[PDB]
Design a protein around this motif. Structure first.
Motif, PDB file in Angstrom:
ATOM      1  N   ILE A   1     -37.406 -10.993  39.079  1.00 25.97           N
ATOM      2  CA  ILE A   1     -37.958 -12.258  39.536  1.00 25.97           C
ATOM      3  C   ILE A   1     -36.966 -13.386  39.270  1.00 25.97           C
ATOM      4  CG2 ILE A   1     -39.183 -13.033  37.453  1.00 25.97           C
ATOM      5  CD1 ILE A   1     -40.891 -12.920  40.861  1.00 25.97           C
ATOM      6  N   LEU A   2     -35.996 -13.120  38.391  1.00 28.22           N
ATOM      7  CA  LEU A   2     -35.068 -14.155  37.950  1.00 28.22           C
ATOM      8  C   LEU A   2     -34.037 -14.466  39.027  1.00 28.22           C
ATOM      9  CD1 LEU A   2     -34.317 -13.420  34.238  1.00 28.22           C
ATOM     10  CD2 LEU A   2     -36.072 -14.886  35.237  1.00 28.22           C
ATOM     11  N   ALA A   3     -33.633 -15.732  39.085  1.00 31.63           N
ATOM     12  CA  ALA A   3     -32.593 -16.132  40.022  1.00 31.63           C
ATOM     13  C   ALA A   3     -31.226 -15.640  39.558  1.00 31.63           C
ATOM     14  CB  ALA A   3     -32.553 -17.653  40.179  1.00 31.63           C
ATOM     15  N   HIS A   4     -30.323 -15.479  40.517  1.00 33.09           N
ATOM     16  CA  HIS A   4     -28.964 -15.045  40.238  1.00 33.09           C
ATOM     17  C   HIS A   4     -28.001 -15.838  41.101  1.00 33.09           C
ATOM     18  CE1 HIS A   4     -31.398 -11.482  39.115  1.00 33.09           C
ATOM     19  NE2 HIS A   4     -30.532 -11.404  38.118  1.00 33.09           N
ATOM     20  N   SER A   5     -26.780 -16.014  40.596  1.00 31.39           N
ATOM     21  CA  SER A   5     -25.791 -16.815  41.307  1.00 31.39           C
ATOM     22  C   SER A   5     -24.460 -16.096  41.507  1.00 31.39           C
ATOM     23  CB  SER A   5     -25.577 -18.178  40.641  1.00 31.39           C
ATOM     24  OG  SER A   5     -25.099 -18.056  39.311  1.00 31.39           O
ATOM     25  N   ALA A   6     -24.382 -14.805  41.191  1.00 29.54           N
ATOM     26  CA  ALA A   6     -23.215 -14.035  41.605  1.00 29.54           C
ATOM     27  C   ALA A   6     -23.095 -14.095  43.125  1.00 29.54           C
ATOM     28  CB  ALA A   6     -23.355 -12.574  41.158  1.00 29.54           C
ATOM     29  N   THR A   7     -21.874 -13.938  43.650  1.00 29.17           N
ATOM     30  CA  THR A   7     -21.805 -13.989  45.108  1.00 29.17           C
ATOM     31  C   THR A   7     -22.313 -12.708  45.765  1.00 29.17           C
ATOM     32  OG1 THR A   7     -19.949 -13.738  46.690  1.00 29.17           O
ATOM     33  CG2 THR A   7     -19.498 -14.819  44.585  1.00 29.17           C
ATOM     34  N   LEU A   8     -22.162 -11.559  45.107  1.00 33.10           N
ATOM     35  CA  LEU A   8     -22.637 -10.290  45.636  1.00 33.10           C
ATOM     36  C   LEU A   8     -23.212  -9.482  44.489  1.00 33.10           C
ATOM     37  CD1 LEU A   8     -22.802  -8.332  48.059  1.00 33.10           C
ATOM     38  CD2 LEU A   8     -20.589  -7.441  47.337  1.00 33.10           C
ATOM     39  N   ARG A   9     -24.376  -8.875  44.711  1.00 35.67           N
ATOM     40  CA  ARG A   9     -25.048  -8.073  43.698  1.00 35.67           C
ATOM     41  C   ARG A   9     -25.152  -6.635  44.185  1.00 35.67           C
ATOM     42  NH1 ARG A   9     -30.098  -9.210  41.758  1.00 35.67           N
ATOM     43  NH2 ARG A   9     -29.355  -8.802  39.620  1.00 35.67           N
ATOM     44  N   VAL A  10     -24.721  -5.703  43.340  1.00 33.40           N
ATOM     45  CA  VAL A  10     -24.703  -4.285  43.662  1.00 33.40           C
ATOM     46  C   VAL A  10     -25.583  -3.571  42.651  1.00 33.40           C
ATOM     47  CG1 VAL A  10     -23.273  -2.246  44.025  1.00 33.40           C
ATOM     48  CG2 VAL A  10     -22.354  -4.538  44.518  1.00 33.40           C
ATOM     49  N   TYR A  11     -26.632  -2.922  43.140  1.00 36.41           N
ATOM     50  CA  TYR A  11     -27.521  -2.128  42.308  1.00 36.41           C
ATOM     51  C   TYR A  11     -26.975  -0.710  42.205  1.00 36.41           C
ATOM     52  CZ  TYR A  11     -31.732   0.686  41.339  1.00 36.41           C
ATOM     53  OH  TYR A  11     -32.638   1.580  40.827  1.00 36.41           O
ATOM     54  N   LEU A  12     -26.788  -0.238  40.977  1.00 35.69           N
ATOM     55  CA  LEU A  12     -26.248   1.085  40.702  1.00 35.69           C
ATOM     56  C   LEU A  12     -27.305   1.929  40.007  1.00 35.69           C
ATOM     57  CD1 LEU A  12     -23.576   2.624  40.875  1.00 35.69           C
ATOM     58  CD2 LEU A  12     -22.927   1.584  38.730  1.00 35.69           C
ATOM     59  N   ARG A  13     -27.402   3.203  40.391  1.00 38.22           N
ATOM     60  CA  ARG A  13     -28.352   4.102  39.753  1.00 38.22           C
ATOM     61  C   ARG A  13     -27.801   5.520  39.776  1.00 38.22           C
ATOM     62  NH1 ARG A  13     -30.467   3.598  45.107  1.00 38.22           N
ATOM     63  NH2 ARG A  13     -31.065   5.623  46.020  1.00 38.22           N
ATOM     64  N   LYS A  14     -28.360   6.357  38.906  1.00 39.38           N
ATOM     65  CA  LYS A  14     -28.036   7.775  38.903  1.00 39.38           C
ATOM     66  C   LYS A  14     -28.696   8.481  40.079  1.00 39.38           C
ATOM     67  CE  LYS A  14     -27.398   8.570  33.944  1.00 39.38           C
ATOM     68  NZ  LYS A  14     -27.971   9.236  32.739  1.00 39.38           N
ATOM     69  N   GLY A  15     -27.960   9.410  40.678  1.00 41.67           N
ATOM     70  CA  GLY A  15     -28.523  10.286  41.683  1.00 41.67           C
ATOM     71  C   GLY A  15     -28.404  11.746  41.297  1.00 41.67           C
ATOM     72  N   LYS A  16     -28.667  12.622  42.256  1.00 43.49           N
ATOM     73  CA  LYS A  16     -28.589  14.050  42.014  1.00 43.49           C
ATOM     74  C   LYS A  16     -27.128  14.489  41.893  1.00 43.49           C
ATOM     75  CE  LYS A  16     -30.229  16.287  45.336  1.00 43.49           C
ATOM     76  NZ  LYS A  16     -31.226  16.767  46.330  1.00 43.49           N
ATOM     77  N   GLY A  17     -26.926  15.622  41.227  1.00 45.22           N
ATOM     78  CA  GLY A  17     -25.592  16.186  41.099  1.00 45.22           C
ATOM     79  C   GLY A  17     -24.612  15.330  40.329  1.00 45.22           C
ATOM     80  N   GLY A  18     -25.095  14.503  39.403  1.00 48.78           N
ATOM     81  CA  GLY A  18     -24.232  13.626  38.640  1.00 48.78           C
ATOM     82  C   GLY A  18     -23.707  12.436  39.408  1.00 48.78           C
ATOM     83  N   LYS A  19     -24.116  12.269  40.658  1.00 46.56           N
ATOM     84  CA  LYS A  19     -23.597  11.180  41.458  1.00 46.56           C
ATOM     85  C   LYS A  19     -24.216   9.859  41.029  1.00 46.56           C
ATOM     86  CE  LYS A  19     -22.583  14.103  45.403  1.00 46.56           C
ATOM     87  NZ  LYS A  19     -21.159  13.790  45.068  1.00 46.56           N
ATOM     88  N   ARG A  20     -23.523   8.788  41.379  1.00 45.87           N
ATOM     89  CA  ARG A  20     -24.061   7.445  41.279  1.00 45.87           C
ATOM     90  C   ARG A  20     -24.228   6.899  42.686  1.00 45.87           C
ATOM     91  NH1 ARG A  20     -23.545   9.644  37.018  1.00 45.87           N
ATOM     92  NH2 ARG A  20     -23.586   8.631  34.959  1.00 45.87           N
ATOM     93  N   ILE A  21     -25.268   6.088  42.868  1.00 46.01           N
ATOM     94  CA  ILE A  21     -25.638   5.534  44.165  1.00 46.01           C
ATOM     95  C   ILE A  21     -25.607   4.022  44.039  1.00 46.01           C
ATOM     96  CG2 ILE A  21     -27.383   5.477  45.992  1.00 46.01           C
ATOM     97  CD1 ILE A  21     -28.575   7.984  44.636  1.00 46.01           C
ATOM     98  N   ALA A  22     -24.978   3.365  45.002  1.00 41.59           N
ATOM     99  CA  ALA A  22     -24.862   1.918  45.009  1.00 41.59           C
ATOM    100  C   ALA A  22     -25.512   1.340  46.258  1.00 41.59           C
ATOM    101  CB  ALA A  22     -23.395   1.502  44.969  1.00 41.59           C
ATOM    102  N   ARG A  23     -26.225   0.228  46.078  1.00 43.03           N
ATOM    103  CA  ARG A  23     -26.866  -0.481  47.170  1.00 43.03           C
ATOM    104  C   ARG A  23     -26.621  -1.969  46.993  1.00 43.03           C
ATOM    105  NH1 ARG A  23     -33.261  -0.058  48.512  1.00 43.03           N
ATOM    106  NH2 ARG A  23     -32.726   2.129  48.055  1.00 43.03           N
ATOM    107  N   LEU A  24     -26.344  -2.660  48.093  1.00 43.08           N
ATOM    108  CA  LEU A  24     -26.232  -4.109  48.043  1.00 43.08           C
ATOM    109  C   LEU A  24     -27.613  -4.740  48.013  1.00 43.08           C
ATOM    110  CD1 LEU A  24     -23.372  -4.723  50.565  1.00 43.08           C
ATOM    111  CD2 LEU A  24     -23.280  -4.178  48.119  1.00 43.08           C
TER     112      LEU A  24
END
Length: 218
Positions: free
Chosen positions: A179-202
């Motif tokens: 809910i908090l505001a942010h002021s970075a120019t770009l925010r990338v959400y990172l999470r664990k996926g299957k097979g040890g992979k990491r998944i990134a979403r803008l």
């Protein structure tokens, strides 16, 4: 000045970002503990030192560490496995531990001195990492009234970082453990996926990558 781009080491993540992380911008990666934020920071601290045709900016690095998570031997490993001299790559990282949020804020102002000093050398500062951007703010500003106070202090800290990025043509890369505001120019959400992979979403497609002896890669 024209924007520069730094490869993350992953073609997938680079495509998601429009060609890599940008100078004259703050890129925030956020995600749970273990999502790979610090591994990405370590990889970028190597990649930026590459020449432009290999995805770097011939740049030096400044690193502000709030959690004692910087690992010089990880830098050396990533560098060697990408064909770079591990000790030269490590030498081009200026490193500081921030003891609290007020010290963290002073260190960003302090960084300007070295940025100016290096600006016209062959390896100007091109990457400034704050890992973690928020940990001290979260521990210190807590309870009723802290939301407004913490957000105002963070806004000033981010304004200082935006100024360095924009004035000196630097990519600022920051991490945030979420809910908090942010002021970075770009925010990338990172999470664990299957097979040890990491998944990134803008935030406001998804890239997939692995953490390897080369840092991160597809």
């Amino acid at each position: 000045a024209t924007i520069g781009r730094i490869s993350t080491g992953s073609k997938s993540l680079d495509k998601l970002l429009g060609g890599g992380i940008e100078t004259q911008a703050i890129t925030e990666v956020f995600g749970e503990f273990g999502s790979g934020k610090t591994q990405l920071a370590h990889t970028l601290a190597v990649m930026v030192q590459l020449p432009p045709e290999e995805g770097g900016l011939n740049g030096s690095v400044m690193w502000i560490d709030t959690e004692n998570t910087f690992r010089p031997e990880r830098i050396r490993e990533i560098a060697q496995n990408r064909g770079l001299d591990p000790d030269e790559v490590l030498k081009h990282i200026a490193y500081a531990r921030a003891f609290n949020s007020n010290h963290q804020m002073l260190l960003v102002q302090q960084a300007e001195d070295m940025i100016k000093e290096l600006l016209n050398t062959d390896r100007p500062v091109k990457l400034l990492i704050v890992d973690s951007l928020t940990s001290h703010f979260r521990s210190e500003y807590i309870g009723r009234g802290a939301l407004a106070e913490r957000q105002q202090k963070l806004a000033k800290h981010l304004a200082d970082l935006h100024r360095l990025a924009n004035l000196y043509d630097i990519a600022v890369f920051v991490t945030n453990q979420v809910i908090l505001a942010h002021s970075a120019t770009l925010r990338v959400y990172l999470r664990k996926g299957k097979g040890g992979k990491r998944i990134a979403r803008l935030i406001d497609g998804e890239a997939v990558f692995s953490i390897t002896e080369k840092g991160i890669e597809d």
